[PDB]
Amino acid sequence: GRKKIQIQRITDERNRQVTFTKRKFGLMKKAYELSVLCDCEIALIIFNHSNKLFQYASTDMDKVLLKYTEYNEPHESRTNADIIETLRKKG
Amino acid sequence: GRKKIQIQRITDERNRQVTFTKRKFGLMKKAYELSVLCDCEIALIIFNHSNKLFQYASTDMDKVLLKYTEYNEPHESRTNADIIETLRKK
């Protein structure tokens, strides 16, 4: 963008909503592209601060959610902490 | 990047795997940024073609998934078809 920003909670109500809408679409667009390019299944669940639900699924949410419950074994799991740490040790 | 690509299945297996790993991180990084910048809760579930499971959650997966089961109310719902539609119309 016009400037680099810090990854910190935006307190201005209007910028938060504008950014939320913009980046949520960006995020879904990238999920679309990833599912198609690499033939993967992807479900994405977002609750905004107002606790409203937004959802995306490459094909169908319930198939993915079903696939998830039947998954017994060890997987890869990441959270914001893991992502931040990985970025720190990119330098 | 060096050449623009069309969004269609990559047939070369090894470029597909390289692209999966790089773009998977890209997606998770964008989710992290959206989650902190706009103070929202995000969960992400990925099954690759080999049906291996990859998951991301802003805070705790089980927490987010559970709240999802309690929320049935009318919300936004998108699929690849919807995105492809919005891209046509943009």
Binding site: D62, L65, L66, Y68, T69 | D62, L65, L66, Y68, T69
Partner: peptide, 17 residues
Amino acid sequence: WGSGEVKQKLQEFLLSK
């Protein structure tokens, strides 16, 4: 598979752990 039926199935599976 209802939408509420997979959610309600998801609910069990979580609480079961």
